[PDB]
Amino acid sequence: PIRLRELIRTIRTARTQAEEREMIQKECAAIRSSFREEDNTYRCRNVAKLLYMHMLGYPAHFGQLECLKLIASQKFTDKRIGYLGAMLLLDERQDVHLLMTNCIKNDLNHSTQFVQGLALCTLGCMGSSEMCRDLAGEVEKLLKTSNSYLRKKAALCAVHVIRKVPELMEMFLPATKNLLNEKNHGVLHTSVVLLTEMCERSPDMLAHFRKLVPQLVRILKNLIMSGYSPEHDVSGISDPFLQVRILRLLRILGRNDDDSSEAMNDILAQVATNTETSKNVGNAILYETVLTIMDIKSESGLRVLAINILGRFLLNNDKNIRYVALTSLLKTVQTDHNAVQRHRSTIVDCLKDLDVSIKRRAMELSFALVNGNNIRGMMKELLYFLDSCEPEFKADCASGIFLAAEKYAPSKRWHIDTIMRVLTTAGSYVRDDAVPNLIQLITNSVEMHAYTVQRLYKAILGDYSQQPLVQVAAWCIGEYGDLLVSGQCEEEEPIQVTEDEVLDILESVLISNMSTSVTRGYALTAIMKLSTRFTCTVNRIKKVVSIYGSSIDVELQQRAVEYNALFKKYDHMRSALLERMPVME
Amino acid sequence: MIHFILLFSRQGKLRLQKWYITLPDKERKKITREIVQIILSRGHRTSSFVDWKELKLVYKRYASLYFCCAIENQDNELLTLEIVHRYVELLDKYFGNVCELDIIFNFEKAYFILDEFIIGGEIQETSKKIAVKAIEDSDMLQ
Amino acid sequence: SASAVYVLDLKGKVLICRNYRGDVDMSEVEHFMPILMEKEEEGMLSPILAHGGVRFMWIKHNNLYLVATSKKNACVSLVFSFLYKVVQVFSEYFKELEEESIRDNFVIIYELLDELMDFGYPQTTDSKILQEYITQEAPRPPATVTNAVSWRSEGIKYRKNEVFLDVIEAVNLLVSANGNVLRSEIVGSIKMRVFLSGMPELRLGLNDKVLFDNTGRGKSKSVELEDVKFHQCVRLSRFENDRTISFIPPDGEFELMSYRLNTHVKPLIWIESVIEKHSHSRIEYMVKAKSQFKRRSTANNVEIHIPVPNDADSPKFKTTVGSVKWVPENSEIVWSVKSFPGGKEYLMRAHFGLPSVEAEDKEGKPPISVKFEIPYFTTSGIQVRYLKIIEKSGYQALPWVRYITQNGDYQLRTQ
Amino acid sequence: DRKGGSYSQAAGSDSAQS
Amino acid sequence: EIFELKAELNSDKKEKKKEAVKKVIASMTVGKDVSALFPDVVNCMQTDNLELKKLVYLYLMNYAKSQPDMAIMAVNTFVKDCEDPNPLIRALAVRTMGCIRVDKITEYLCEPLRKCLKDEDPYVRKTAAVCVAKLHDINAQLVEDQGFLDTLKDLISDSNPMVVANAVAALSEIAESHPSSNLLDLNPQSINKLLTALNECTEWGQIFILDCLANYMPKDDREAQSICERVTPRLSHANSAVVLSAVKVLMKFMEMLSKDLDYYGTLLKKLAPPLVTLLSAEPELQYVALRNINLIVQKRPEILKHEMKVFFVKYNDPIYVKLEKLDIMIRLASQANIAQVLAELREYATEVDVDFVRKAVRAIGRCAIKVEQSAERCVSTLLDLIQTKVNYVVQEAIVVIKDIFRKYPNKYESVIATLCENLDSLDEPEARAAMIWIVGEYAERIDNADELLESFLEGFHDKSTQVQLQLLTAIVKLFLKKPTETQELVQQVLSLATQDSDNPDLRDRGYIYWRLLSTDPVAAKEVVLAEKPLISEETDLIEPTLLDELICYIGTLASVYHKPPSAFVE
Amino acid sequence: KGENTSLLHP
Incomplete structure (x- = not known):
């Protein structure tokens, strides 16, 4: 019987990774040999060693039957070891917990409180779709018990069952009725959590659960009055978890009702001024109260107080406080949007903050705060942030700028210029999914094509390694070759488009090593469409199409062969299928 | 609820692990490695809050071993820090001058205390003395 | 063309480093560990690392990685040879390859590293010569290094002239799971522990198939080794001219020749x-x-x-x-x-x-x-003819040699 | 004695080759 | 600590000074910034102890760039030590002078460099050459002003063959860093003199000697024959780097060699045993040997025609070594050992390396495509791999089958039925697109092609751009071939890819397909379902211009990277 | 070391 302490000391004594792995393998072999003999005396030490090995990163597939055997044992230590093994190495996807249902049911009626509590905790931690179905009746039976130490466990089991089985919440409707008078903090917290979970699962119980609003308000007032207590009094806040749960219930209770908001208005006003945010608990309580006020139909004074609190917390030098303030501002974006405009300077400064989370929150707030009047002004700031943004935020910044341009663009020309600048500066940071959106936006716009075509031609000849920019330029060329170059059928005066540079650029892109088979296909399609769109460069693309028909790629080879066949046998019918595609939202 | 709570050392060794979401073993190991890399590559002025995979990855280590949690974006961030501080205080009271070396030796006791404190990612014991008394009574049972 | 060669540890700490050119900053060693961790985690780990424009070639030692940062496209084979020579010298001087001896003989280690190579060009490669010039417990450099004969130090005096040879045989058999052997190669090893007085010039003679054919005696059992590599002291000119194995034996155990040819016989x-x-x-x-x-x-x-x-x-x-x-x-x-x-x-x-x-x-x-x-088994059947021990003073030598057959790459594919 | 083949005396050259 | 160390260093006790120096070295070696104590150690520099002088020189070299201003108090000590009778002291002083990265320090050392240029000691001569090379690298203009080129050129024509090799290496480095103007090329007498000293050169000296011949361009067959004869003995050297340098020199000489002469045949015959010996080198050098073989394989592939058994990847071989062995086997694949290659690929397909398994599958597919004599064997191996029930293995088999169908699909109609029901539930885009393309192009031997495409049409609008294009092409091909059972399928595909498809290229393809269907369905068979020509596979061999340049660049870092020397340096 | 130190130092 090797003790867990001895195994830990041996593991600590190993230095090389290979030596530690060999020691772990020897220990696992010893454990498997002991289990194969059906050892029951030193099973606790073997279980502890197996748990340590699994936590260290060692396989434990063979150590599944031993845990099941120890679960159905009689020793308290053996029962605890089995419960720990089921919680750690037993899961719904493992499928080894199916045989544990009978053991749980047998232990569900066990007289010992620790065994029943351990079984309930294991069931809650390893809740399965089928285990909850066969254990739903047992959970409801213990929900009506008067055991304060077991009421919290029963509430947790019911919440886990509801989360795993949303259709099983109907059986808990009458079990929790008349349970708002629990003196114990744990029982009351469990009841409040169960009520909140039931309300969030379905809105049918909102009316039934909304009747207890005065009781919750009275309980919150009593808790606020009783600010001193040896239990739950940490950092000057007594029952901070209970206060947070009450605030969350108030925010989620009556979110679209006036009576519920009016009933809790006095409690929210008292809490907003009777709570000190000097400690972390107080700051968290203030943030929760502000969030509840914002998410509910609170009064104008409550909204003003929440805005002032958010502004004060924004100036706090604490990184956690700044992150909380940014999250609250982002959540209260649609609500109190005009009042959020007073923190534009703070939002801009948060982008340059030395916190990755703080910078992300500031960027999200700036993106959500873009309106139809500050979009033009904020465009320069967004471009500067994207140009000097982190590699993980450059793509996100470009996506946000594109979304803002497509949503609240002041004008098509300004939006087109911003999109072109983003594509030129984004380079490889432009998302490939945004390419179809940009193509659709370009197709929809039919008023700015000559300038856009010229810009696309200028940008394509400069660089071609940008897959999104290259694809956008190819699509624009294919769509508006007839407008990019005017009078390019024959030799003319020196202009931007001469009817030959575009073909050479397309050929280079198709043959360039910087092709992912998507830009090459777009270039081939544009070249094929340019046969009818452009009448200046003719009789030369047919040879390339015929040569391009023997490409290594099956799709590319088939496309080249089809293009060559169309050029050689359907020369007159080329224009019959070269019509412009329809434009739709 | 807290999707997963694990205790990891500064060097990367994990002293605790408790996930409330059923994930594949390879996927769980990859997630733990990514969390360790993010925490191991984070400064002291990052606010101790990270939104990784849409999860409130809050990292706050009061010693060489660090502590991390992952909860959904539906509650206040300070609540997680308060719960972590309360759990640390309860563990210190149960053990007495808790150190990194004692954590490895008392892995089973720490797991039992964590199970008795929080179950399924939700708070189960709001009071601090009641949980300690229950843990002591369970330990005295044998 | 390595900028600097350094000895690292398993924890990423550099046991010892010695700059040779100075074209690469010494802080680049820190980024080597994260790069190695990423490569191992992604399967892209290779001995020749690359940190931007500077390549940090590393070799896994007994306890630490021998990282040799480089800047230009220098001789990678030369760098590997220098690293192998340094490892051999460390093994000769220090009986243990771990962090215990790295931090225990740093005073002599720095001098040995300085004397080994300069400006990226290795200069000293004789372990005996290095010990005769650098010791951990200084006179002018020995004349043997300056002289052409650097594989036999002059002035050696011994009570008896005894040479201990070792006919090491390595039988490597690659038997597939189907029962057919694909890779069946036998590699010879002629290692002699020569311990005599002076610097005698060995005149190797064996029952080689090529030698027997050249001499007209290609009718008995002659070993036709596909690959035969001479030692440092072995004169390649005599071997190329008429297979004359004439060279000065070293002071101690050394591998003069190593046969390497395919085997067409049944497995042992x-x-x-x-x-x-x-x-x-x-x-x-x-x-x-x-x-x-x-x-x-x-x-x-x-x-x-x-x-x-x-x-x-x-x-x-x-x-x-x-x-x-x-x-x-x-x-x-x-x-x-x-x-x-x-x-x-x-x-x-x-x-x-x-x-x-x-x-x-x-x-x-x-x-x-x-x-x-x-x-005591000679599967190849190659029999040594004679060993020409010639001394200017004149002495009677009594060389000894033993034939040892062992199993090398005798791996059978599993079913 | 010693494992791996006992040491044996070696000649100086092939006496039959002159 | 620091104050106590400074007080100890400012004492007159030799034992105390030695202890302080050892403590400083340990702190410096342990990672302690001892550069601030460099001025204190400057006074305690002129010491009779040789060990103390070495430590002081090392500290000054490590504290020279940190405190260049404080380094001005060591010129007198270096000048005094430059005349030390002990050759070791002179060599150490020469090494320290070139190791000091001080712009104003090398200026005052020009006279000592000139004095030590004619050092009689071969070690002293080598140290002087190294110092001259270091000064030239630090200051090429200073080296040119000092006029060390004339001394360096005459150094090769002197004794001390190791010193001659060191001087030759220094001269090559100077010319290598030179812009090629005023090259140090030598006439055939210099080559003969180097060859005479080649046999007396050491392992390091042999490499340096072989490096010089890499730049000279032979012009006569007799001179080339003599050079090849001289380099032949180098192949019997235990030095792997020496073997690699000799192989590179022989390959360079073979460029001007005449195939009619028997010298080329003898060189090719003697090279194979050298390649076999090099293949059995250490794992670190195994990758270098594999890279060298791959570089030389494209030049003289007939040299290693019979070298196939050694190309197998060993069980204990590294992942990089296994990849190199697989690449060598693929490049060295031949019809003579086709069965052996297939067996090795099957053996290599049973490994636990997912990347290794993918590489083995790719190599098997490349071998099957290159040689059509084993097309049936390749198809059988792919079928066995698919039946092996491996997700990655199944995807690799599907990709290989798709590649083979596009290359040799004339006799690929017998695998459609087997591949029709092959656990097509895989969502891998590479396998899914390949299967869709195979079904579309081979929609003749399968009577349930429409039924199979029905399952993949559920998420056609959100599967992928390439996957959606492949599905649309397969639907169009099925409609053109058999429109009776796919008349509604074609319309549904056109509606999904034309109305519900927002991709620009995909939308254009769908519109073109709809226009072709509505214009002339008969012409769609000759336009869409046309007989494509032979697919031009990309040649894996390097360009002849790059191959010639890479032949000279043998043993450099670019050979392992397979990149030009100017494309890898900074 | 750094492991025997108290997590909260209380």
Whole structure:
């Protein structure tokens, strides 16, 4: 019987990774040999060693039957070891917990409180779709018990069952009725959590659960009055978890009702001024109260107080406080949007903050705060942030700028210029999914094509390694070759488009090593469409199409062969299928 | 609820692990490695809050071993820090001058205390003395 | 063209570094560890690292990685040769390859590193010469290095002139799981421990097929080694001209020649393995070993390693000759035999259970290899003719040599 | 004695080759 | 600590000074910034102890760039030590002078460099050459002003063959860093003199000697024959780097060699045993040997025609070594050992390396495509791999089958039925697109092609751009071939890819397909379902211009990277 | 070391 302490000391004594792995393998072999003999005396030490090995990163597939055997044992230590093994190495996807249902049911009626509590905790931690179905009746039976130490466990089991089985919440409707008078903090917290979970699962119980609003308000007032207590009094806040749960219930209770908001208005006003945010608990309580006020139909004074609190917390030098303030501002974006405009300077400064989370929150707030009047002004700031943004935020910044341009663009020309600048500066940071959106936006716009075509031609000849920019330029060329170059059928005066540079650029892109088979296909399609769109460069693309028909790629080879066949046998019918595609939202 | 709570050392060794979401073993190991890399590559002025995979990855280590949690974006961030501080205080009271070396030796006791404190990612014991008394009574049972 | 060669540790701490050119900042070593961790985690780890425009080639040593940062496209083979020479010199000077000796002989280590190479060009490569000029417990440099004869130090005086040769034979057999041997190569090794007075010029003579054909005696058993590599002291001009192996033997044990040619003979040991593994129920190990070597030869310390299941437990061995021990660290059963006479036939019958829970992922099928070593056997049939020991003073030498046959890459593909 | 083949005396050259 | 160390260093006790120096070295080696104590150690520099002088020189070299201003108090000590009778002291002083990265420090050392240029000691001569090379690298203009080129050129024509090799290496480095103007090329007498000293050169000296010949361009067959005869003995050297340098020199000489002469045949015959010996080198050098073989394989592939057994990847071989062996086997694949290659690929397909398995599958597919004699064997191996029930293995088999169908699909109609029901539930885009393309192009031997495409049409609008294009092409091909059972399928595909498809290229393809269907369905068979020509596979061999340049660049870092020397340096 | 130190130092 090797003790867990001895195994830990041996593991600590190993230095090389290979030596530690060999020691772990020897220990696992010893454990498997002991289990194969059906050892029951030193099973606790073997279980502890197996748990340590699994936590260290060692396989434990063979150590599944031993845990099941120890679960159905009689020793308290053996029962605890089995419960720990089921919680750690037993899961719904493992499928080894199916045989544990009978053991749980047998232990569900066990007289010992620790065994029943351990079984309930294991069931809650390893809740399965089928285990909850066969254990739903047992959970409801213990929900009506008067055991304060077991009421919290029963509430947790019911919440886990509801989360795993949303259709099983109907059986808990009458079990929790008349349970708002629990003196114990744990029982009351469990009841409040169960009520909140039931309300969030379905809105049918909102009316039934909304009747207890005065009781919750009275309980919150009593808790606020009783600010001193040896239990739950940490950092000057007594029952901070209970206060947070009450605030969350108030925010989620009556979110679209006036009576519920009016009933809790006095409690929210008292809490907003009777709570000190000097400690972390107080700051968290203030943030929760502000969030509840914002998410509910609170009064104008409550909204003003929440805005002032958010502004004060924004100036706090604490990184956690700044992150909380940014999250609250982002959540209260649609609500109190005009009042959020007073923190534009703070939002801009948060982008340059030395916190990755703080910078992300500031960027999200700036993106959500873009309106139809500050979009033009904020465009320069967004471009500067994207140009000097982190590699993980450059793509996100470009996506946000594109979304803002497509949503609240002041004008098509300004939006087109911003999109072109983003594509030129984004380079490889432009998302490939945004390419179809940009193509659709370009197709929809039919008023700015000559300038856009010229810009696309200028940008394509400069660089071609940008897959999104290259694809956008190819699509624009294919769509508006007839407008990019005017009078390019024959030799003319020196202009931007001469009817030959575009073909050479397309050929280079198709043959360039910087092709992912998507830009090459777009270039081939544009070249094929340019046969009818452009009448200046003719009789030369047919040879390339015929040569391009023997490409290594099956799709590319088939496309080249089809293009060559169309050029050689359907020369007159080329224009019959070269019509412009329809434009739709 | 807290999707997963694990205790990891500064060097990367994990002293605790408790996930409330059923994930594949390879996927769980990859997630733990990514969390360790993010925490191991984070400064002291990052606010101790990270939104990784849409999860409130809050990292706050009061010693060489660090502590991390992952909860959904539906509650206040300070609540997680308060719960972590309360759990640390309860563990210190149960053990007495808790150190990194004692954590490895008392892995089973720490797991039992964590199970008795929080179950399924939700708070189960709001009071601090009641949980300690229950843990002591369970330990005295044998 | 390595900018600087440094010795690292398993924790990423550099045990010792010595800059040679100064074209690369010393802080680049810190980024090597994260790069190695990423490459190992992504499968892109290679001995020749690359940190931007500076390449940090590293070699896994016994306890630390020998990182040699480089800047330009220098001789990678030259850098590898320098690293191997440095490792050999460290092994000669320090009997242990770990962090204990790295931090214990730094005073002499720095001097040895400085004397070894300068400006990226190695200069000193003789371990004996280095010990005669750099010691851990200084005079002018020895004239042997300045002289052409750097493989035989002059002035050596010994009471007796005894040379201990070693005919080391490496039998590598790559037998596929289908029963056919693909890679069957035998590599010779002519290593002599010459300990005499002075610097005698060895005149090697053996029963070589090429030599016999040239001399007209190509009718007896002559060894036709596909690859034969001369030592540093061996004169390549005589070998190219008429296969004359004339060279000054070194002071101590050294490898003069190493034959390397394919083998077309039957294997010395014929091992038949049977895997009667039930579906998560039991495992059968029908191992039968047949000695194809001559009965007059005995294989001392024969260890045929049979890989057992990774999750197998409670195994029972039913063999006839040779102790069988299952090593949990090795995760395999090794058919340990003290002495294996030629022609011996050993049959083994393994039987062990398997866990009920199926394995999440497969573990592969490592090949089965044996650790047989039967000395006093010359399978190749190459017989040494004579060793021309010539001394200017004139003395009677009594060289000795022993032929040792061992199992090298004798790996059999698993079924 | 020693494992791996006992050491044997070696000649100076091939006496039959002159 | 620091104050105590400074007080100890400012003492007159030799034992105390030695202890302080050892403590400083340990702190410096342990990672302690001892550069601030460099001025204190400057006074305690002129010491009779040789060990103390070495430590002081090392500290000054490590504290020279950190405190260049404080380094001005060591010129007198270096000048005094430059005349030390002990050759070791002179060599150490020469090494320290060139190791000091001080712009104003090398200026005052020009006179000592000139004095030590004619050092009689071969070690002293080598140290002087190294110092001259270091000064030239630090200051090429200073080296040119000092006029060390004339001394360096005459150094090769002197004794001390190791010193001659060191001087030759220094001269090559100077010319290598030179812009090629005023090259140090030598006439055939210099080559003969180097060859005479080649046999007396050491392992480091042999490499340096072989490096010089890499730049000279032979012009006569007799001179080339003599050079090849001289380099032949180098192949019997235990030095792997020496073997690699000799192989590179022989390959460079073979460029001007005449195939009619028997010298080329003898060189090719003697090279194979050298390649076999090099293949059995250390794992670190195994990758270098594999890269060198790959570089030389494209030049003289007939040299290693019979070298196939060694190309197998060893069980204990590294992942990089296994990849190199697989690449060599693929490049060295031939019809003579086709069965052996297939067996090795099957053996290599049973490994636990997912990347290794993918590489083995790719190599098997490349071998099957290159040689059509084993097309049936390749198809059988792919079928066995698919039946092996491996997700990655199944995807690799599907990709290989798709590649083979596009290359040799004339006799690929017998695998459609087997591949029709092959656990097509895989969602891998590479396998799914390949299967869709195979079904579309081979929609003749399968009577349930429409039924199979029905399952993949559920998420056609959100599967992928390439996957959606492949599905649309397969639907169009099925409609053109058999429109009776796919008349509604074609319309549904056109509606999904034309109305519900927002991709620009995909939308254009769908519109073109709809226009072709509505214009002339008969012409769609000759336009869409046309007989494509032979697919031009990309040649894996390097360009002849790059191959010639890479032949000279043998043993450099670019050979392992397979990049030009100017494309890898900074 | 750094491991025997108290997590909260209380």
